[PDB]
Amino acid sequence: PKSMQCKVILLDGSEYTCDVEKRSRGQVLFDKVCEHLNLLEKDYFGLTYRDAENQKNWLDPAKEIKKQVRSGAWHFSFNVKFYPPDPAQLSEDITRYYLCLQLRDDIVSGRLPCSFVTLALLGSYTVQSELGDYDPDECGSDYISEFRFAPNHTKELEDKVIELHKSHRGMTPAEAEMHFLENAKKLSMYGVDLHHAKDSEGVEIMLGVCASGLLIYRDRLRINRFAWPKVLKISYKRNNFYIKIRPGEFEQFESTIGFKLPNHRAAKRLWKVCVEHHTFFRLL
């Protein structure tokens, strides 16, 4: 029985290596990574791989790994797939911990924009969780944390983390992680998967996929929002993505909104993430 070596980047930046039978479905590898991580609330998470175009794709747990990675390396990342709107409702602290790790990477990477003060506040909870109570012995007037808090670090930001860290004395890791999530969950781009697209007129937009629905970022004035219940049908064809917007009260007909994606693979990827978000966040 021939086995393929899999390498998984974990959310703490370390690497997990295992083997699976070469005809394995994604679920087999995902089950091994989750066991390694001691993670039971697995439904929020998944594995990503880079396709031949270097795009991030979700590994489909129901399909053979080899039919997804195709000609590429069996190299994956462990990621949050479905960002819970209310992390306080997750049953385990360790779930909230991985969610924190993911969001810290979302912030550092610039995928999750954040004000100065929220960067410092989120940083201060991470430091409280990881080092415990503020200690002046470690931090002089010139202190710079090993911790990555933001796309761009300034001394002002490091100083503000320390000032907020002072206020969290006696806070337990689970308690600091819950506070981290209470603040992070409110950010306008929390759990928004962004896709480059063009509207029916060829104007460049972004499409956001999240728990609530589909967001159209047309310009800074007017953001269109389609709550999942208002969406009956999601389709793709060639380079196009279509949504069928439920008829309003006393309207005779469904309406159709069409978007152009860079290529057919980009259209299919957006279609699958929408269908997956719609199925997941319906059961709420």
Ligand X SMILES: CN1CCN(C(=O)Nc2ccccc2)CC1
Residues forming the site for ligand X (CB under 6 A): 188, 210, 212-213, 215, 225-227
Largest CA distance in the chain: 71
What six digits make up the tokens of 29?
A: 């590898």
The DSSP bridge partners found for residue 159 are: none
Residue 258 structure tokens: 């069409």
C-alpha 49/C-alpha 243 separation (Å) is 27
Rounded to a whole number of angstroms, the minimum distance from the CB of residue 30 to ligand X is 28
**Least CB distance from residue 6 to ligand X, whole Å?**
35
Nearer to ligand X, 61 or 85 (CB): 85
User: What's the closest the beta carbon of residue 184 comes to ligand X, in angstroms?
Assistant: 13
Q: What is the nearest approach in angstroms of ligand X to the Cβ of residue 228?
A: 8
Q: Which is nearer to ligand X, 66 or 233 (CB)?
A: 233
65 closest CA partner among 33, 42, 40: 33
**Smallest gap from residue 225 Cβ to ligand X (A):** 3
By beta-carbon proximity to ligand X, the closer residue of 42 and 218 is 218
At residue 183, φ and ψ (nearest 5 deg) are -80, -50
Task: Give the nearer residue to ligand X in terms of CB position, either 242 or 281.
Answer: 281
| Cα→Cα distances 270→29, 116, 128, 263, Å | 24, 31, 38, 11
The strand order across the sheet containing 56-58 reads: 15-21, 3-9, 75-80, 45-50, 56-58
- Nearer CB in complex with ligand X: 109/188: 188
Per the CB < 8 A criterion, the answer to whether 27 and 68 are in contact is no
Nearest-angstrom CA–CA distance, 89 and 29:
27
Q: How many residues make up the chain in this entry? A: 284
Nearer to ligand X, 99 or 210 (CB): 210
**Tokens coding 55:** 């795009």
Smallest gap from Cβ 189 to ligand X, in A, equals 9
Concatenating the DSSP letter of every residue in 59-98 gives: --TTSBSHHHHTTS-SEEEEEESS--S-GGGSS-HHHHHH
The values of phi and psi at residue 123, to 5°, are -55, -45
- For CA atoms 91, 80, 10, 135, the dihedral sign is negative
Is the Cβ of residue 210 or residue 243 nearer to ligand X in the bound state?
A: 210
Comparing CB distances to ligand X, the nearer of 3 and 279 is 279
Minimum distance between the CB of residue 226 and ligand X, rounded to whole angstroms?
A: 6
Nearest distance, CB of residue 278 and ligand X, angstroms: 12
